[PDB]
Design a protein around this ligand. Sequence first.
Ligand SMILES: [Mg+2]
Ligand SMILES: [Mg+2]
Ligand SMILES: [Mg+2]
Ligand SMILES: [Mg+2]
Ligand SMILES: [Mg+2]
Ligand SMILES: [Mg+2]
Ligand SMILES: [Mg+2]
Ligand SMILES: [Mg+2]
Ligand SMILES: [Mg+2]
Ligand SMILES: [Mg+2]
Ligand SMILES: [Mg+2]
Ligand SMILES: [Mg+2]
Ligand SMILES: [Mg+2]
Ligand SMILES: [Mg+2]
Ligand SMILES: [Mg+2]
Ligand SMILES: [Mg+2]
Ligand SMILES: [Mg+2]
Ligand SMILES: [Mg+2]
Ligand SMILES: [Mg+2]
Ligand SMILES: [Mg+2]
Ligand SMILES: [Mg+2]
Ligand SMILES: [Mg+2]
Ligand SMILES: [Mg+2]
Ligand SMILES: [Mg+2]
Ligand SMILES: [Mg+2]
Ligand SMILES: [Mg+2]
Ligand SMILES: [Mg+2]
Ligand SMILES: [Mg+2]
Ligand SMILES: [Mg+2]
Ligand SMILES: [Mg+2]
Ligand SMILES: [Mg+2]
Ligand SMILES: [Mg+2]
Ligand SMILES: [Mg+2]
Ligand SMILES: [Mg+2]
Ligand SMILES: [Mg+2]
Ligand SMILES: [Mg+2]
Ligand SMILES: [Mg+2]
Ligand SMILES: [Mg+2]
Ligand SMILES: [Mg+2]
Ligand SMILES: [Mg+2]
Ligand SMILES: [Mg+2]
Ligand SMILES: [Mg+2]
Ligand SMILES: [Mg+2]
Ligand SMILES: [Mg+2]
Ligand SMILES: [Mg+2]
Ligand SMILES: [Mg+2]
Ligand SMILES: [Mg+2]
Ligand SMILES: [Mg+2]
Ligand SMILES: [Mg+2]
Ligand SMILES: [Mg+2]
Lengths: 205, 80, 85, 81
Amino acid sequence: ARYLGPKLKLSRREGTDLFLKSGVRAIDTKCKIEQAPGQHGARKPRLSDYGVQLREKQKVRRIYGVLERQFRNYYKEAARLKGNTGENLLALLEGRLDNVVYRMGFGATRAEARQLVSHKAIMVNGRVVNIASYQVSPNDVVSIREKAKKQSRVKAALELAEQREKPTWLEVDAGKMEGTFKRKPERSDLSADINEHLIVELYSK
Amino acid sequence: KIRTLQGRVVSDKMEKSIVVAIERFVKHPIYGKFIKRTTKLHVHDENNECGIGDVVEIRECRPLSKTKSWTLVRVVEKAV
Amino acid sequence: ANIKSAKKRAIQSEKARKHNASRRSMMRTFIKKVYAAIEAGDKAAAQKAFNEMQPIVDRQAAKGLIHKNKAARHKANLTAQINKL
Amino acid sequence: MVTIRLARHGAKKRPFYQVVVADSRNARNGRFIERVGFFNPIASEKEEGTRLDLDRIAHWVGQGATISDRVAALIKEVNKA
RNA sequence: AAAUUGAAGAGUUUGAUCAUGGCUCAGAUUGAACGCUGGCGGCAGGCCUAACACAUGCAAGUCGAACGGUAACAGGAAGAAGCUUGCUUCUUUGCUGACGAGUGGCGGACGGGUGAGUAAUGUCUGGGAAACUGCCUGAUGGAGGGGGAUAACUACUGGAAACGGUAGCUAAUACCGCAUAACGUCGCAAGACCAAAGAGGGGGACCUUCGGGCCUCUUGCCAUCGGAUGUGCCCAGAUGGGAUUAGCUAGUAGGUGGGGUAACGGCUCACCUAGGCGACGAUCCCUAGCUGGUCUGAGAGGAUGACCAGCCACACUGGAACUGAGACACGGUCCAGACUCCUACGGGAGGCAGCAGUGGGGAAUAUUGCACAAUGGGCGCAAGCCUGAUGCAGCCAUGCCGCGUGUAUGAAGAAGGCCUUCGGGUUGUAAAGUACUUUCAGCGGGGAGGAAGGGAGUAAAGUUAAUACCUUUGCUCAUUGACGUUACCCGCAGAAGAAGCACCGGCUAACUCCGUGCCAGCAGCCGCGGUAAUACGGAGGGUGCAAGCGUUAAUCGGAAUUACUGGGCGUAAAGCGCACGCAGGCGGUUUGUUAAGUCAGAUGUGAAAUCCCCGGGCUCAACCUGGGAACUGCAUCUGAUACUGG
Ligand SMILES: [Mg+2]
Ligand SMILES: [Mg+2]
Ligand SMILES: [Mg+2]
Ligand SMILES: [Mg+2]
Ligand SMILES: [Mg+2]
Ligand SMILES: [Mg+2]
Ligand SMILES: [Mg+2]
Ligand SMILES: [Mg+2]
Ligand SMILES: [Mg+2]
Ligand SMILES: [Mg+2]
Ligand SMILES: [Mg+2]
Ligand SMILES: [Mg+2]
Ligand SMILES: [Mg+2]
Ligand SMILES: [Mg+2]
Ligand SMILES: [Mg+2]
Ligand SMILES: [Mg+2]
Ligand SMILES: [Mg+2]
Ligand SMILES: [Mg+2]
Ligand SMILES: [Mg+2]
Ligand SMILES: [Mg+2]
Ligand SMILES: [Mg+2]
Ligand SMILES: [Mg+2]
Ligand SMILES: [Mg+2]
Ligand SMILES: [Mg+2]
Ligand SMILES: [Mg+2]
Ligand SMILES: [Mg+2]
Ligand SMILES: [Mg+2]
Ligand SMILES: [Mg+2]
Ligand SMILES: [Mg+2]
Ligand SMILES: [Mg+2]
Ligand SMILES: [Mg+2]
Ligand SMILES: [Mg+2]
Ligand SMILES: [Mg+2]
Ligand SMILES: [Mg+2]
Ligand SMILES: [Mg+2]
Ligand SMILES: [Mg+2]
Ligand SMILES: [Mg+2]
Ligand SMILES: [Mg+2]
Ligand SMILES: [Mg+2]
Ligand SMILES: [Mg+2]
Ligand SMILES: [Mg+2]
Ligand SMILES: [Mg+2]
Ligand SMILES: [Mg+2]
Ligand SMILES: [Mg+2]
Ligand SMILES: [Mg+2]
Ligand SMILES: [Mg+2]
Ligand SMILES: [Mg+2]
Ligand SMILES: [Mg+2]
Ligand SMILES: [Mg+2]
Ligand SMILES: [Mg+2]
């Protein structure tokens, strides 16, 4: 129930940097970055009108590590709720606990935060939350358990994630390893390289 | 206090009873037209005081016969 | 019969049918008498059997065999049928 | 009779009883007249595991309904508590 | 405050274009079947056809506080034991705990199953008058004195057996009279008449025939008028198709009376009229249980009625009735008919469409399991006893939902596979190695909640003669789990036990090589295949999905392709050959009245659940759950008079 394959292949076919790796070396210096995977690299995939919507839905799915039956549900909630639907689809994929671990930088990547959660180590508020697709509300003070404060590989990600862009809709404390999801994240605090309104038009056929 | 219904008579050749046409005004559930629809009732009356072509005002009571449950009160516009 | 509580209330049924047919044909006999004396004009000899027929319907009602309105349709048909001789 | 009794709903191993005022011929989950409260024995703290319309469970006993034993224990709980 | 926020097109007629018109695909969906494949868990779903036939257990019992009694258990006081000087007989003794058979009271009319019939006898919505109503509850009164049989038993007898027959003895809350009798029935009246039953727990001293009257409370009985509750009945709307079915009906339509059920009534007879339904679709033929809802749809609409729940109908087919408050009765009764099984040939017995289960049909649907521990239900004052309803278990990927099969570094771009302009590109940072983590399964350890009550006491108080018994009220004591080696946390070990499927010509995301060469073959439409095939068959790479993936069956959408919202008729399918015309649809213009259409408000009803909005609880979701809008309707009383009808 997760993509177990190679990961630079999925950065390659989407043709962008989707942060599937750490940052210890850049994406360019580990593989070719424009060329599409397969025999037919350098045949540049200039593709149809439906294809530019499909390669836009798959980018925002493959960022977070969702499968399509979960993602269709995440669309239906964001058509049900009030407000917009781009600005209510990009809220639910940021409220996941497997993503508020990573945006606070308790883990190096987006598919390690799933292991830190789903190996029973990330207690929201004072009870362990094993299940990775939790819907973290505002003000929940997510911390790190004391069995997994002593890991080298969580502070190794702390020193890594202090060097990226720090977010605005969060408040991490460094030494105690304890976050605070403050408010719900706005539109432009999640980067606008996601063409937002091409995930609406697929499912709204 | 009582719930009468007007109507018009059709057949009163039988003894001590008339039959009354009542003319309700339905609206068709789809096409939006305003049709007429009629219902035919038996009306018991004593004294046999009604004929064809006459406007009566009936009211509901216990079943006097097999297919009959209505007795009249008055005969307005008594003639053709 | 397969259940003991069906056998027992199968033989508590004839023991009630025999009595409920005796004490009902008694009543129908005593109404047949006040219908025998009802076309022969005996206003002083139909009234006798009607006064013999007051308690033997107003008792078989109260012991639960007919209902009280059957015990009061008789005594308002026969009273008119007697007093209009 | 007519009687005030529980009637079980909810999910397996986690019950949730409503109370009903219904005819004691009829079934458990079946027909009733006035659904007048509930009883949630797997409630949490600071939420309400009982809520009984004690006006209606008086007006429906003055017209003669035998309150069954669990509803009687519920009234004994919530009136004193 | 919120309860909504909702609409996509493409291919195909011609050398080619526009137009009309079909056919086909994209998406959602399931009581689902089949193929390839398979780790776990949570909550729901599982004979759609043969209403076919059924072996085997099991699903309706209780009450000794209604009564005779002892068929056994086990204590008693006897006392005849071998007498051991203490006891381990047993007839006998119902005196006690209780209790096999039988009389009686209440329950089997509930709960449980299926949809054969049923086009209005049903169902849904809203109105009514002429009715009964066990248990529960309120008020006012009663509750005297007699009686006859009879099962159980005993004796004798028939029959293969089922089941009887005869003659004796015995009781009550079973059964029947007399008395009594009103606020009830009958009656304009005077008057006439109608019921019943006890038991139990305690008792001071008065009676005390040794049982008890006597006092006390608890519950039980009878009668009337009331309340709820369930049911019977009636009327106007609505609930498939057909006109290549256009005429049906004699108890049929109405009346006067007799009879009849609880009540009205052609409900059933006896007479007198000649009527009733029908083009707003009667009769007849085909098909079907309906509704809350469900799936789709932007909506209006179209199809459907499984699980949950309200109503009706049915119980081997075809009938009729008894008991009873309630049935014309699933696990009752008699009568035929078909089919099974026993028989001594005379005669008998049975009805899974209750939970399980075998045969059979079929593409296809489970275990002959545990427990009354909860919530219900029957009897019981109570304890307790029964409960295949229900609560949980077993099997199945059948559906919805969650998690896992590692995470991070890692370039010598390893080997091997394939492509190749013979330089290289590609699998591919993927594997290896190097460090890191242990959810789930695996072995251990601890341990929530579903459990309220009931019991044995003690304290006062309410009662009465009573400091008794009892009833409610505060406490103290030992207490009661089917699931259950439970949900759930903490320990041990090690990347170990956990990835498959469809497609790659266009529509539609993904391209090359070899092996066949109008053959073998694919196909949802257009088309491919005749030696360079991006379509057939293999491999390499690739894309979409994931404990699923695909193909067929079915509905809806796209289909504005049955169009009210929303289409056409000179040539594409389409204007009767032309007229006169009753039923039907529509009606210039002004004042006045009426309130039917219409419009506003209010009460009554539209059951719960589900859909939707804000909230709460199981680590989140599914699932569960509180309150409210919704249920576009329908009836009643008020109002309004512009338009339409009179
Ligand atoms: Mg899934
Ligand atoms: Mg009786
Ligand atoms: Mg009469
Ligand atoms: Mg508790
Ligand atoms: Mg929106
Ligand atoms: Mg076309
Ligand atoms: Mg062509
Ligand atoms: Mg297999
Ligand atoms: Mg059968
Ligand atoms: Mg058998
Ligand atoms: Mg016994
Ligand atoms: Mg029965
Ligand atoms: Mg049928
Ligand atoms: Mg009864
Ligand atoms: Mg008696
Ligand atoms: Mg008397
Ligand atoms: Mg008559
Ligand atoms: Mg029936
Ligand atoms: Mg039958
Ligand atoms: Mg009877
Ligand atoms: Mg049976
Ligand atoms: Mg018989
Ligand atoms: Mg069965
Ligand atoms: Mg079989
Ligand atoms: Mg077969
Ligand atoms: Mg088996
Ligand atoms: Mg139980
Ligand atoms: Mg049993
Ligand atoms: Mg499963
Ligand atoms: Mg190589
Ligand atoms: Mg484990
Ligand atoms: Mg417990
Ligand atoms: Mg393929
Ligand atoms: Mg393409
Ligand atoms: Mg193919
Ligand atoms: Mg060739
Ligand atoms: Mg070739
Ligand atoms: Mg193809
Ligand atoms: Mg449409
Ligand atoms: Mg349409
Ligand atoms: Mg179609
Ligand atoms: Mg057209
Ligand atoms: Mg033409
Ligand atoms: Mg012409
Ligand atoms: Mg003309
Ligand atoms: Mg006009
Ligand atoms: Mg009006
Ligand atoms: Mg509702
Ligand atoms: Mg919540
Ligand atoms: Mg007008």
